[PDB]
Design a protein around this ligand. Structure first.
Ligand SMILES: CCCCCCCCCCCCCCCCCC(=O)OC[C@H](COP(=O)([O-])OCC[N+](C)(C)C)OC(=O)CCCCCCCCCCCCCCCCC
Ligand SMILES: CCCCCCCCCCCCCCCCCC(=O)OC[C@H](COP(=O)([O-])OCC[N+](C)(C)C)OC(=O)CCCCCCCCCCCCCCCCC
Ligand SMILES: CCCCCCCCCCCCCCCCCC(=O)OC[C@H](COP(=O)(O)OCCN)OC(=O)CCCCCCCCCCCCCCCCC
Ligand SMILES: CCCCCCCCCCCCCCCCCC(=O)OC[C@H](COP(=O)(O)OCCN)OC(=O)CCCCCCCCCCCCCCCCC
Ligand SMILES: CCCCCCCCCCCCCCCCCC(=O)OC[C@H](COP(=O)(O)OCCN)OC(=O)CCCCCCCCCCCCCCCCC
Ligand SMILES: CCCCCCCCCCCCCCCCCC(=O)OC[C@H](COP(=O)(O)OCCN)OC(=O)CCCCCCCCCCCCCCCCC
Ligand SMILES: CCCCCCCCCCC1=C(C)C(=O)C(OC)=C(OC)C1=O
Ligand SMILES: CCCCCCCCCCC1=C(C)C(=O)C(OC)=C(OC)C1=O
Ligand code: SF4
Lengths: 105, 318, 96, 115, 257, 98, 80, 70, 175, 156
């Protein structure tokens, strides 16, 4: 019983807070605006059954934009390997990762 | 050198509380056709030092029935929240310049009630229980207009920044467009700060001392100096809201002297109201802030929303 | 009086915003070179740290796209001191 | 950072005014000085008995009117929008709904206290 | 299908309305005791509060029962006179006058006329003393603590009048059976005139502070209404009748000196 | 995901099991419902302010409103218990067993 | 209507002032010439960046420099 | 007479003059003889951090003008 | 251990939740929920939501003051349990705290933990935007959008509060 | 010695702070409390000496027993005195509080409050004048001034 009054009577009651790609106040972009736009424009009108298997790649990019799971896993790997090489004395950090580097602008 | 700024904030606003005790007793005395203290120091100028030394060399008396943890935590939280509501106040520069300093003032007003409230609960006494639930009945009465009045006055400011409120009142005082809000805010701050005619928590005649009736000297000092820090902060806040003064960016001491003497006049006004009125019954308190101030406060909220739109005078949020 | 002064304040806000807008291209170009500088400095030290590790692929994007993704806070300041981190990631909130 | 330092300072010299309040004077503790105060005679019962609230409907409706200043509070910011007549109509709708609620709470004698 | 568990289950009522099982509400018993700024020194109200709505007042008294009127039996009439000063100890010479009139009525003698005029003069000074005490401490127990301090200077001046006429500020033992003890000193009545010339402005400023004040009215207008028949039934007298409209004053109806 | 979501969901589950296991006292469980609303508030708001989806920033406020709009309802359904019985003990409400 | 109005002004002047202020706040922005200027000031405040346009060849109403005479102007705000 | 309340008020007046005056001086001591930078919005913080980056001494208040460019 | 500040505030958040979820007494339940709301408005304030944190602090302060009045008026016994007056309250309080600090030890030693979801062990500073929001905080503009865009949301919320007052006055009548 | 000088000046400091901040309690019994109110009145004015009432015993320094102590209130008097923190003092005002007074041979009167509490200053009169009561209070201040608490601690 999804009585779609909002498309029947043409009113916009809650379609605006629905996604991050909608009209935002002062044109403020979300951090995953391009990823969600690509996932929605990919899977528009093809149905959920085809959308779960044909737009899997854009949905994986968008979900990894949101929670940043692969990024933080990669940063765990990099930071942990750095800590191991510091503890073993097999690496010294560069002077721009310590402070004395005359930062850009 | 910020810790020195914190100390030079919070130690003079303990000395101001100390000499507010003397100013209270002497202005209260001369309004009662008598004198205040003039024996202890030269015209009483050393009476608060005697009171401050006396309360910390007297036996503290934690009671037998008192839930001791909340009993000790209540004056600590009292004096902590009394000190920390001075930090967004622009003097012309605040200690901590908050973008939402007004909501900080309001939320730390709402947390300061639990000092009175847990003191009345923890000190397991019947008069303390009456004084605590009369603080409940007082706070549910004043908080239902303390935010709408303070909302309607900042619709001419543009934000909740207290430092912007100096720029807002650079031409005219904000009591001229909002004197019903001002005269209602003043009573809401009387009822906020447990001062007469709205004492109602440390009721001398109904109760014995209300919430702090079990608190002997030492812990009693940190409710009393907390209450006086609340009234000086509240008159400084009322002055910033409605009587904001001239600010020269190259001469800040002119603004400092100006809001100092204005907040001193409003402090004397609190002492002069406490010296002149009978005390409300604490339901007539509630039938005032709900039945009288709240309808008119909603009406003035409608008016102060629509009027910057009506005249194209919506203030900037930046 | 508040009508006159709030209209003047709105005009002064517009003047400040146009000063901001006129500065914004230089700030955006410096911010682009800033983040590309820090990402290249992190990548040129990702090869040294990730050298003994088998199966690693330096500079491997975690996305299947080739579009530019905005650098995250841990992507830029991940290999740097806690002074630079706490200045860059809680600095505006903790400031006064 | 400065807020945590300021709060730690205020809490510290509010709790260092208590630890020099309890440990500095001389105590003579006996089990009548710490008795409950009831104006001289012994208290009848506990003060943990139910203290019946007369203002209870006003106490509940305070929880429904305190949300309004979580709703009416963005109005200094909501005046900065570019759809302003809609904003003004919805704002006056919210204060009007608060007022109709207060009128209904008057007329059924809900703001009066019981007994 | 009744089991061991489903055997104490009585069938539910017909209108689905259960009897209320009237557990006692246990009204909180406040001891509004004698050490209190409101209970005037010696008064133990054992009250029962429904939170703060008063359900029962039990004023225990006798905390100042000194056994005066047994000590009167073992002392002579002149020695029993100063017991009367200490009964209504803000209305001293009125109690002296009442005891004096009782003894003189039994003695079948009357005072001289000048002593009767001095008794009525100091009785009305005494009435000013008691009504200053009554009004100002009633307002002090409500919260207007300032006209207390305003009117006790006037009360101090009338205590100087007592101290000049009799030698003691409060308990004079001055109005005696037979008249008064000692004549008025010279210069007393002129100072009584200089006091009475200015006392009306003091009543005016008390009445300015309280009578038209809305906070004073909201504490006293719908409070403590006494009907006339319950006032006569309870043996009330004075203002307690006259507040309720009972036209009765013993200085008019049963007049003395 | 990120580290703070662990303990905000942990606070949700602690408040869940606090609500879902009663200690014969009803106000202490209305507090557990209000704490579940606090955990939902902080969790949704951390997610929204993380991903900078600004238009749902009004969503927790609305959420918070309905929080008290049922919490007050619980208190209105508390007093009719505590007028019927002297306590709010949930083992007194066992009359609908027959 | 003056009898009922005088009765409610005699018994409840707080509520009469309340309904008067509320009625003015309802009806008075709908009868004011300056409510349009509020919307024009709010949509004339530049929060974002004026993202420029790729000149295809036919945009005669769009300037190429901010000091060009075509484009939206705020002289109405400077005078008022 | 009544003016004997005027000493104590004056002392209280000095005890309200000391904090705010001091913080103005403190805002002119830590910030190079000027006002304290107000960063209410993240653009103001971005300019302030840019000043700290371009000062060369890691202090946001040390300004550099046309003498820094050629 | 300063980059983990939202994590530390979240530990105090869970400590307050174990404090009132053990249900000692609604005095101390209100205490624990005030402590959790007061550190939660610094959890959510370090992501940018100063308005949206000060409001959840302020609304719950008013809420716990009202609930204090009710638990003194209705939910009151002779000996209120503090936390150790009952063995079950202290048992589940110690259980919640030791399980919380157990997963703290597991997530700061492994930097990866898995209870139903997977959670990183790095500080949550890593996931922030590296940009500036101009002359506005985006949460302020978004909550201000409740009047321009959120009109139906205003209507359903204001109607729910109106009938909430009507509903509660219909319940608390007795007849 | 130096330490005797230091404890002597600290005795002077604490005796100054205790005699110049006496807080009596709102506690009268009989006719003497009217005169004790006159000692609070604007002519004699206790508040200029730092002498100001606090209604609770926990925050009071001296108990002026002003009036007649009967048998029915003597345990209330004792519990009120017990609920005062040390240092606490007792000023006995009037003849009935001193030695029974005009009701001395009565069945119902405690013959002097010194049967109940330790009494420091006996103020005589029926009633004593407010000036005589203020004289007794200033004599109590002189009694507090010559206390030797820290000197006797230093010597024991
Ligand atoms: C914030 C404003 C207020 C700040 C605090 C007050 C400032 C002044 C602090 C020092 C005051 C003097 C010491 C505290 C008062 C002690 C009172 C007392 O009874 O002392 C007797 C006690 C000894 O009492 P006693 O041993 O004679 O015991 C008598 C009681 N019986 C027999 C029943 C057990 O002395 C002390 O405790 C000495 C305290 C320290 C003295 C100074 C040391 C050097 C300080 C520099
Ligand atoms: C902050 C700077 C100073 C500000 C001024 C304050 C300083 C002076 C303070 C004096 C001492 C007060 C101490 C506490 C007193 C407490 C009692 C009290 O105040 O009760 C409030 C009293 C209560 O009155 P009441 O209690 O008598 O009411 C009786 C109510 N019934 C009938 C239900 C029983 O008054 C109010 O509530 C009025 C509030 C302020 C009104 C402001 C209205 C402004 C005018 C609006 C427009 C009017 C015209 C209509 C529109 C026309 C359009 C063209
Ligand atoms: C359309 C404009 C906007 C309206 C909505 C916005 C309102 C803003 C203010 C918020 C008010 C909230 C609370 C209002 C409660 C009103 C109901 C009420 O209280 O009625 C009772 C009252 C008499 O009180 P009583 O029942 O005796 O109470 C005993 C205890 N005191 O009854 C009365 O006193 C009578 C009240 C009705 C008559 C008032 C007449 C005022 C006329 C002013 C001029 C016209 C203004 C335009 C509005 C039309 C008014 C008819
Ligand atoms: C997995 C399933 C179990 C999850 C919780 C584990 C700890 C609690 C279980 C221990 C058993 C004791 C217990 O909780 O008893 C139920 C108790 C109410 O019983 P009560 O009336 O207090 O006592 C009489 C008889 N025990 O009710 C309570 O104690 C209610 C409070 C429980 C709060 C639990 C919060 C800790 C975190 C849980 C997981 C997340
Ligand atoms: C922002 C402003 C804040 C201001 C706060 C303070 C306000 C009041 C300032 C002081 C006012 C005057 C104080 C007078 C103290 C007593 C003076 C006196 O005469 O003392 C005499 C006394 C006994 O000496 P004796 O030997 O008996 O003398 C016989 C004489 N032939 O001998 C003694 O009492 C011994 C000497 C004691 C001296 C104490 C002086 C007062 C100290 C107050 C502390 C704060 C000082 C200011 C700090 C900030 C500024 C630097
Ligand atoms: C058991 C009983 C309790 C016993 C212990 C009692 C301890 C003291 C309790 C009282 C103090 C509670 C403090 C609660 C958090 C307050 C946060 C605050 O002050 O926020 C206001 C302000 C908003 O300004 P904003 O707009 O952010 O401007 C900066 C951006 N340009 O924010 C700022 O300016 C941002 C500055 C940094 C803020 C850091 C985050 C808050 C830290 C919270 C610490 C823990 C709070 C504990 C609460 C306990 C409540 C009882
Ligand atoms: C350094 C801080 C010193 C704080 C001193 C607190 C003790 C002083 C209390 C004096 C007092 C005041 C001001 C007072 O307001 C008052 O009410 C009339 C009193 O009597 C009941 C008092 O005793
Ligand atoms: C604040 C002004 C000074 C008040 C001093 C009161 C001290 C205690 C006196 C006892 C008393 C009280 C309370 C009192 O209220 C009273 O009523 C007039 C008395 O006389 C019968 C009393 O004796
Ligand atoms: S000593 Fe005498 S005058 Fe004084 S209170 Fe006792 S009876 Fe009254």
């Amino acid at each position: 019983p999804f009585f779609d009054v909002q498309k029947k009577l043409g009113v916009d009651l809650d379609h605006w807070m629905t996604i991050q790609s909608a009209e935002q106040p002062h044109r403020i972009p979300a951090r995953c605006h391009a990823f969600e736009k690509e996932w929605i424009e990919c899977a528009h009108g093809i149905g959920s059954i085809r959308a779960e298997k044909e737009c899997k790649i854009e949905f994986e990019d968008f979900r990894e934009c949101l929670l940043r799971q692969k990024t933080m896993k990669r940063l765990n790997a990099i930071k942990r390997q750095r800590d191991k090489l510091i503890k073993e004395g097999k690496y010294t950090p560069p002077p721009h990762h310590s402070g004395q580097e005359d930062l850009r602008p | 050198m910020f810790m020195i700024n914190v100390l030079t904030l919070i130690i003079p606003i303990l000395l101001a509380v100390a000499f507010l005790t003397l100013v209270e007793r002497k202005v209260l005395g001369y309004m009662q056709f008598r004198k205040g203290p003039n024996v202890v120091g030269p015209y009483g100028l050393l009476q608060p030092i005697a009171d401050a030394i006396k309360l910390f060399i007297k036996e503290p008396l934690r009671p037998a029935t008192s839930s001791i943890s909340m009993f000790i935590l209540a004056p600590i939280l009292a004096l902590t929240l009394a000190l920390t509501m001075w930090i967004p106040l622009p003097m012309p520069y605040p200690l901590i310049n908050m973008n939402l300093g007004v909501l900080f003032m309001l939320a730390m007003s709402s947390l300061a009630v639990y000092s009175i409230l847990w003191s009345g609960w923890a000190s397991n006494s019947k008069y303390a229980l009456i004084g605590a639930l009369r603080a409940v009945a007082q706070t549910i009465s004043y908080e239902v207009t303390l935010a709408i009045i303070l909302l309607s006055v900042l619709l001419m400011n543009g934000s909740f920044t207290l430092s912007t409120l100096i720029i807002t009142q650079e031409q005219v005082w904000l009591i001229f467009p909002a004197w019903p809000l001002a005269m209602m805010w003043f009573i809401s701050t009387l009822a906020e700060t447990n001062r007469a005619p709205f004492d109602l928590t440390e009721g001398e005649s109904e109760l014995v001392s209300g919430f702090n009736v079990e608190y002997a000297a030492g812990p009693f000092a940190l409710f009393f100096m907390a209450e006086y820090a609340n009234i000086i902060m509240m008159n400084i806040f009322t002055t910033t809201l409605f009587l904001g003064a001239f600010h020269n960016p190259y001469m800040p001491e002119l603004y400092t002297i100006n809001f100092t003497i204005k907040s001193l006049l409003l402090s004397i006004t609190f002492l002069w109201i406490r010296a002149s009125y009978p005390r409300f019954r604490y339901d007539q308190l509630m039938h005032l802030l709900w039945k009288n101030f709240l309808p008119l406060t909603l009406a003035l909220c409608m008016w102060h929303v629509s009027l910057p739109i009506l005249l194209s005078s919506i203030p900037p949020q930046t | 009086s508040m009508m006159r002064w709030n209209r003047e304040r709105r005009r002064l806000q517009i003047e400040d915003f146009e000063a901001r807008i006129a500065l914004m291209p230089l700030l955006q170009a410096e911010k682009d070179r800033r983040v590309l500088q820090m990402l290249r400095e992190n990548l040129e030290e990702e090869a040294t740290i990730m050298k003994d590790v088998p199966g690693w692929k330096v500079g491997e994007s975690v996305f299947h796209t080739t579009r530019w993704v905005t650098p995250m806070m841990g992507e830029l300041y991940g290999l740097r001191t806690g002074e630079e981190i706490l200045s860059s990631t809680y600095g505006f909130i903790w400031y006064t | 950072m400065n807020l945590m330092i300021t709060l730690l300072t205020n809490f510290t010299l509010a709790t260092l005014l208590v630890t020099i309040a309890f440990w500095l004077p001389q105590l003579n503790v006996y089990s009548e000085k710490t008795s409950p105060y009831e104006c001289g005679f012994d208290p009848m019962g506990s003060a943990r008995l139910p203290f019946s609230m007369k203002f209870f409907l006003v106490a509940i409706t305070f929880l429904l009117f305190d949300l309004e200043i979580a709703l009416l509070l963005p109005l200094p910011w909501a005046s900065q929008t570019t759809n302003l007549n809609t904003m003004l109509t919805m704002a006056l709708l919210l204060i009007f709904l608060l007022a109709v609620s207060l009128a209904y709470e008057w007329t059924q004698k809900g703001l009066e206290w019981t007994e | 299908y009744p089991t061991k568990e489903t055997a104490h289950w009585k069938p539910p009522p017909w209108n689905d309305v259960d009897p209320p099982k009237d557990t006692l509400v246990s009204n909180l018993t406040l001891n509004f005791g004698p050490q209190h700024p409101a209970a005037h020194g010696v008064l133990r109200l054992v009250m029962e509060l429904s939170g703060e709505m008063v359900r029962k007042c039990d004023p225990h008294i006798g905390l100042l029962h000194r056994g005066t009127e047994k000590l009167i039996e073992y002392k002579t009439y002149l020695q029993a006179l100063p017991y009367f000063d200490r009964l209504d100890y803000v209305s001293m010479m009125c109690n002296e006058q009442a005891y004096s009139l009782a003894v003189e009525k039994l003695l079948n003698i009357q005072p001289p006329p000048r002593a009767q005029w001095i008794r009525v003069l100091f009785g009305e000074i005494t009435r000013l003393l008691n009504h200053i005490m009554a009004v100002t401490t009633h307002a002090l127990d409500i919260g207007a603590m300032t006209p207390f301090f305003w009117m006790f200077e006037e009360r101090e001046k009338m205590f100087e009048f007592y101290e000049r006429v009799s030698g003691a500020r409060m308990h004079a033992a001055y109005v005696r059976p037979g008249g008064v003890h000692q004549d008025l000193p010279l210069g007393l009545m002129d100072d009584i005139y200089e006091f009475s010339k200015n006392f009306s402005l003091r009543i005016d400023e008390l009445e300015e502070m309280l009578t038209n004040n809305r906070i004073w009215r909201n504490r006293t207008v719908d409070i403590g209404v006494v009907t006339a028949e319950d006032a006569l039934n309870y043996g009330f007298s004075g203002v307690m009748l006259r507040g309720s409209g009972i036209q009765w004053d013993l200085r008019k109806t049963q007049p003395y000196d | 995901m990120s580290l703070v979501y662990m303990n905000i969901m942990m606070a949700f589950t602690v408040s869940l099991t606090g609500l879902l296991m009663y200690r014969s006292h009803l106000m202490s469980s209305l507090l557990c419902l209000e704490g579940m609303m606090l955990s939902l508030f902080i969790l949704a708001t951390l997610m929204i302010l993380n991903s900078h989806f600004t238009l749902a920033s009004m969503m927790p406020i609305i959420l918070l409103v309905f929080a008290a709009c049922e919490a007050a309802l619980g208190l209105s359904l508390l007093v009719m218990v505590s007028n019927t019985y002297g306590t709010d003990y949930v083992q007194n409400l066992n009359l609908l067993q027959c | 209507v003056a009898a009922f109005l005088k009765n409610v002004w005699a018994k409840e002047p707080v509520l009469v002032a309340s309904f008067a202020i509320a009625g003015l706040a309802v009806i008075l922005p709908t009868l004011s010439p300056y409510t349009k200027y509020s919307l024009m000031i709010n949509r004339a405040t530049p929060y974002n960046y004026p993202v420029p346009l790729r000149d295809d060849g036919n945009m005669p109403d769009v300037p190429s420099h901010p000091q060009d005479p075509q484009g939206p102007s705020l002289e109405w705000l400077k005078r008022l | 007479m009544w003016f004997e309340v005027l000493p104590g008020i004056a002392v209280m007046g000095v005890c309200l003059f000391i904090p705010g005056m001091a913080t103005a001086r403190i805002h002119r001591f830590s910030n190079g003889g000027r006002e304290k930078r107000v960063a209410h919005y993240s653009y103001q913080w971005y300019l302030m951090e840019r000043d700290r980056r371009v000062s060369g001494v890691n202090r946001y208040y040390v300004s550099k003008g046309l003498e820094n460019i050629d | 251990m300063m980059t983990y500040i939202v994590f530390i505030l979240s530990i105090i958040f869970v400590m307050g939740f174990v404090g009132f979820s053990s249900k000692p007494s609604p005095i101390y339940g209100g205490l624990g929920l005030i402590v959790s709301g007061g550190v939660g408005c610094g959890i959510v304030l370090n992501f940018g939501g100063s308005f949206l944190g000060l409001m959840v602090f302020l609304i719950y302060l008013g809420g716990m003051m009202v609930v204090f009045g009710y638990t003194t008026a209705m939910a009151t016994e002779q000996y209120p349990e503090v936390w150790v007056s009952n063995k079950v309250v202290l048992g589940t309080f110690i259980t919640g705290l030791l399980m919380e600090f157990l997963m703290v030890y597991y997530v700061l030693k492994d930097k990866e933990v898995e209870i139903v979801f997977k959670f990183n062990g790095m500080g949550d500073w890593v996931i922030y935007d590296t940009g500036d929001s101009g002359f506005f905080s985006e949460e302020a503009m978004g909550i201000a959008a409740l009047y321009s865009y959120g009109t139906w949301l205003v209507i359903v919320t204001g109607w729910s509060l109106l009938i909430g007052v009507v509903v509660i006055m219909e319940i608390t009548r007795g007849n | 010695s130096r330490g005797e000088y230091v404890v002597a000046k600290l005795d002077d400091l604490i005796n100054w702070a205790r005699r110049s901040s006496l807080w009596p309690m709102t506690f009268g019994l009989a006719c003497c409390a009217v005169e004790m109110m006159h000692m609070a009145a604007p002519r004699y004015d206790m508040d200029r000496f730092g002498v100001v009432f606090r209604a609770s015993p926990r925050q009071s320094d001296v108990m002026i027993v002003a009036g007649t102590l009967t048998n029915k209130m003597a345990p209330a008097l004792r519990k009120v005195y017990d609920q005062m923190p040390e240092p606490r003092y007792v000023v006995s005002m009037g003849s009935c509080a001193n030695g029974g007074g005009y009701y001395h041979y009565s069945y119902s009167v405690v013959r002097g409050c010194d049967r109940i509490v330790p009494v420091d200053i006996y103020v005589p009169g029926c009633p004593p004048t407010a000036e005589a009561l203020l004289y007794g209070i200033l004599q109590l201040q002189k009694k507090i001034k010559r206390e030797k608490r820290l000197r006797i601690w230093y010597r024991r």
